[PDB]
A paper describes a structure:
The DAP pathway commences with a condensation reaction between l-aspartate semialdehyde (ASA) and pyruvate to form (4S)−4-hydroxy-2,3,4,5-tetrahydro-(2S)-dipicolinic acid (HTPA), catalysed by HTPA synthase (EC 4.2.1.52), also known as dihydrodipicolinate synthase (DHDPS). Lysine regulates flux through the pathway by binding allosterically to DHDPS and inhibiting the enzyme. Thus, DHDPS catalyses the rate-limiting step of the DAP pathway. AtDHDPS enzymes exist as homotetramers, with the active site located within the (β/α)8-barrel and the allosteric cleft in the tight-dimer interface located in the interior of the structure.
To probe the molecular determinants for inhibition, recombinant AtDHDPS1 was co-crystallised with MBDTA-2 using the same crystallisation conditions as for the apo enzyme with the addition of inhibitor. Diffraction data were obtained at a maximal resolution of 2.29 Å, phases solved by molecular replacement and repeating rounds of model building and refinement were performed that allowed us to generate an atomic inhibitor-bound model. Closer inspection of the crystal structure revealed the presence of four MBDTA-2 molecules bound at the centre of the homotetrameric protein, in antiparallel pairs with each molecule, which were stabilised by interactions across three of the monomers. Interestingly, this pocket, albeit distinct to the lysine binding site, shares two residues with it, namely W116 and E147. Specifically, the methoxy group of MBDTA-2 interacts with W116, E147, and H150 from chain B, while the pendant carboxylic acid interacts with S115 from chain A as well as H150 and Q154 from chain C. Additionally, we observed that upon binding, MBDTA-2 forces D117 to adopt a different rotamer conformation, which in turn, results in W116 assuming a different conformation. It must be noted that the four MBDTA-2 molecules were present with 50% occupancy. Consequently, each of the two moving residues, D117 and W116, adopt two distinct rotamer conformations, one of the apo- and ligand-bound states of AtDHDPS1. Given that no major rotamer changes or movement of catalytically important residues were noted, the exact mechanism of inhibition remains elusive. Moreover, an alignment of the primary structure of several DHDPS enzymes from plant species indicates that the residues involved in MBDTA-2 binding are highly conserved across both monocotyledons and dicotyledons and therefore should allow for broad-spectrum inhibition.
Author numbering:
A (entry chain B), C (entry chain B): 55 to 365
B (entry chain A), D (entry chain A): 59 to 365
């Protein structure tokens, strides 16, 4: 019913938080975006978050956001689950974005707790209750960005709603175990923990940044059983990706791989030259064929980069 | 002018009151600002966190700033909260706020979508040039501390009025001892910041309730007894994240309707009972409005998501 | 190429300018809307204009507009051609709406010349040139509403662009003939002329209001050859529909037929009581089975009607 | 007050000038308004058709009104164009315009999506109560005449200041003889309307160019010779739909940049040559700005769709 739709989200192991690429004037580069999503599908990504933090949703106008979701459903909705990031620190915005995203056929919603303008436990519950009934929902707990832990009592209460698909959890393995042991579906939101969460702590899978770069490896990591060697091989890449706040790393890497133009909407700027040289090295160690795109990786010069505040 | 901002000691982060349908209650808002002016508030932040700026549409945001300037601009400095975690938004909001004649802008570092030091600087540089700016460091909400090196660099811009600082007295002192203007962002620390650490003043929530006392606290010299008298009120206000407390208190005082834009909801019954007690201990005449304080029933509160 | 897509629009004979139904609080009633579109499909409507004048596009927020298009493509795009009304008297708006509507998978755009803020012939050309390249486009000439005839020299110039599908023409049969005789595809925008335009003046078909009520009859009228008797039978209905400006009639009729709630976004208000009584009579003469819905037609009381300015 | 609006004789429908990137040129805009004030314009419509209101975003619309009020509100009456063919939009724009302190609203009947007489009345009734309102009848643009019966009914509302009428002198006289304030909306008829038909004044495009002359025309009594002197300039201005002419002329006079938001484009070269001639016949000192009038090349013009 609504049951089957929620179940469809719950069964996904590899969800890519897809990067939004830009044209030199700062508008969406839909061609490059379409290529990224095709690559994700071809390498076994089962879902995509559209316009999340990795996708710089907070930098979009609301129409762009609604357009990108609609676009993703229309082009790829039969080949991958499309999960719109329709959350907000404003309940009103979360309501409208969520209903519009479902009306347009997205398969689920990702909902963060109100950040910056944080609220009480009662308010957080009230917030989630306005959107939980609209369709399959992933609750996103990322206290390092929201500055407010979504406590277990909120998660467990929400999980009585059949539309609550599960949790993107970033607090760690202990918090993951706490939920999975009670049968709540958890996706790890931390690339560098998702192997252990998957195989040691009952996590269903990952909502991933790293899969933007190496979707095949991330798929292996989530499906083919424990593999501490593969996990260790990815760690330097993951450390490189998160040395500045996401999505600064993935934006830089995808430019370097030639699959997105070197165009940044502020307030994001690329990793400096020395870090770009590091990246070339990491690609060589892991093998360029494992990374998205066909073009030889480039370091890029500082002045290849376009930084835009007005677009 | 920047110097005009720099000399302010009492800036109120004004609450935005609502009509039962969720729209702004301009009449109540006007009354709150008048009350602030009458009791010596020298500035107002319009549509900051206390003002629930993040729940406004952009037009309501621009309208409220313009409205405040038109009605009160000759009587109080009007500082628009025109910041955002989006550089594009901050740019547009700031230049529109200035074009409407606001006296200054309050800019936070990008929250949630946090960036690098270089990205933070870039962000600030797109707006700092547009007019007098207060930089807002509130790491407990942004989850990213604006480091001293950033502040010192921004302070070379003559449009940088100063810092609303929340880290504490040591960070306050680090700036004020270098002649950087600081307003404390923490009501429960602002007395000590003001008299012991060189802070110019406070950007205050508590002044929404007791503007007279907060004025005394900032102008009339050290007074640890007044400070101690206010602490229970401050502790009550901040037991849930601002502005839940001030929203609840202003409803209880009868100066704002009991109408909350989600995701905020009022303090529970027992806390409202506590509030009535605190008003009696401090004395009702010190709190905004004339109406006898009420406890209110839970069903008095309107919680709105669609407005 | 782009050729095939334009050709797909050109081959449509029955395009319904679909009414947008509302809930009592003034929001879209997507359930009722979905039922209307299903009815249109089941009775041989081949295309739908989403958010045109009949659909009260001018009363929508931009996100609602983008949402409705995306929604229509997602739910019905495989069963009917979805033509977004993405035009505007503002070139900037027309540009954004058009590209967003195409990104979301709509099959064509309907573009009016700038109304109210009318421009020169040169400006009208410049306006159309910004959006013509984005995909299959129907140019809409309705001088009775725009207060500015799109002259033949503009139409003929635009028709050199392979994305120009054809014209929704309202000036009349002579203007229709002028274009069709040169091989330009024309849809009549006047229900009470579309039979003659179709069979006597080379028009491909109709972009229709009346088909909201009697889709089967309108389909017959456009496919099954000349039929002056059927045409005469529909005339009283069409006269009733247009006695106040569209969409006042169709909003009233659909309420009366029980397929849309009696909810009007201002500045539209329903036809008065005596006209609603007339409508019941017209349904009886033509036969209720020919009209959309299953519910017995009602007159409705004045106070069944909800009129909303704030929604 | 409504009476304050009613007494205005010269209202300029002010042009909105642009920067090369398509954004508002506030500096040039401020200069245009100053010039209007200096030469006796008593009101300004902000973001009407001449002001290309239909090309603005809603925030730019709200910002420009607020800006005009803040900068010029003490020196000139500011009438926001807050109307729309959407009742919801008109409601929001009007109440936000008033909250920002505009003196009046100009409301058109719903155009393009035209409605019934009853719908038109309903539309007007949602906004008339909010403050002093000028009702705008321009059937050549709306494709729907506001009938006298509608005007007479609205005129019972004390907030109805009057009518900007474009139908002609007979319609003007029909209202003014009943003591309804009318401003002519047709520059080439406003002299006769003013002196022969009881019109109070003009809501003018031509005053953007020659504000001094338009003032004389409205205040200093019948002057068929001045009227005849202006007619060639008026005929030039309106050979393409307003504001194509005024946009072109202000670019030629050097007081606005040659930047057009689509779907407007400038008059062709030969018309710009005509313009230079008309300026010489009338005398350059009568036209806004100090710069010698230029013809400009076609490639001087920036046409923008994405701004
Ligand atoms: C994704 O969620 C949202 C996206 C956009 C909005 C925009 C609004 S709300 C409103 O009334 N106005 C007009 C005004 O306030 O004047 C807006 O433009 C609200 C929610
Ligand atoms: C105030 O702190 C809390 C209050 C309530 C809870 C709720 C819990 S804990 C748990 O495992 N389950 C599932 C079960 O036991 O079936 C819950 O629903 C947690 C924290
Ligand atoms: C080397 O790094 C940079 C050097 C210069 C810039 C300049 C920018 S970015 C932006 O939004 N604006 C405002 C505007 O474009 O109006 C600028 O001036 C950015 C980065
Ligand atoms: C406070 O600053 C801002 C407020 C609103 C915006 C929104 C924009 S910009 C643009 O082009 N569009 C149309 C579209 O992208 O569909 C928008 O809706 C940007 C900045
Ligand atoms: C369908 O086409 C459009 C829909 C919406 C827009 C909205 C705009 S444009 C812009 O800059 N801003 C922010 C500001 O101006 O502050 C907006 O909100 C433009 C086009
Ligand atoms: C200034 O008036 C006009 C100027 C040019 C035209 C263009 C025409 S007329 C016609 O039939 N065709 C097709 C053809 O002849 O192949 C045209 O392209 C019409 C009016
Ligand atoms: C019998 O016909 C009618 C009777 C009363 C109304 C009232 C309305 S409609 C609207 O927008 N507003 C403004 C608001 O709701 O704020 C009203 O007061 C409409 C029609
Ligand atoms: C000038 O008056 C208006 C200006 C803008 C609006 C836009 C609105 S209202 C609303 O809810 N939303 C969000 C949504 O519908 O997605 C909007 O964008 C309405 C009136
Ligand atoms: Cl692989
Ligand atoms: Cl308001
Ligand atoms: Cl006191
Ligand atoms: Cl049939
Ligand atoms: Cl501006
Ligand atoms: Cl003069």
């Amino acid at each position: 019913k609504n049951r089957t739709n929620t179940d469809d989200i719950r069964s996904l192991r590899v969800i890519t938080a897809i990067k939004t690429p830009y044209l030199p004037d700062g508008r969406f580069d839909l061609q490059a975006y379409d290529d990224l999503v095709n690559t994700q599908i071809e390498n076994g990504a089962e879902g995509v978050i559209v316009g999340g933090t990795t996708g710089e949703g907070q930098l979009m106008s609301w129409d762009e956001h609604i357009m990108l979701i609609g676009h993703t459903v229309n082009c790829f909705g039969g080949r991958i689950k499309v999960i719109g990031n329709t959350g907000s620190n404003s309940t009103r915005e979360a309501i409208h974005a969520t209903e519009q995203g479902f009306a347009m056929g997205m398969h689920g919603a990702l909902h963060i707790n109100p950040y910056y303008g944080k609220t009480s436990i009662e308010g957080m519950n009230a917030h989630f209750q306005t959107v939980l009934h609209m369709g399959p929902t992933i609750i996103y707990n990322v206290p390092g960005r929201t500055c407010q832990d979504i406590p277990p009592q909120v998660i467990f209460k929400l999980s009585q709603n059949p539309n609550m698909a599960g949790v993107k959890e970033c607090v760690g393995n202990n918090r993951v175990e706490e939920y999975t042991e009670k049968g709540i579906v958890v996706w790890s939101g931390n690339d560098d923990q998702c192997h252990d969460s998957r195989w040691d702590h009952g996590a269903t899978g990952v909502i991933s940044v790293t899969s933007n770069l190496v979707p095949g490896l991330m798929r292996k990591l989530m499906f083919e059983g424990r593999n501490s060697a593969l996990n260790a091989k990815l760690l330097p890449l993951m450390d490189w990706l998160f040395q500045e706040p996401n999505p600064i790393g993935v934006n830089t890497a995808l430019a370097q791989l030639g699959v997105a133009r070197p165009v940044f909407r502020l307030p994001y700027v690329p990793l400096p030259l020395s870090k770009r040289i590091e990246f070339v090295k990491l690609v060589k160690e892991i093998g360029r064929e494992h990374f998205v795109g066909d073009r030889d990786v480039q370091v890029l010069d500082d002045d290849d980069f376009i930084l835009i505040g007005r677009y």
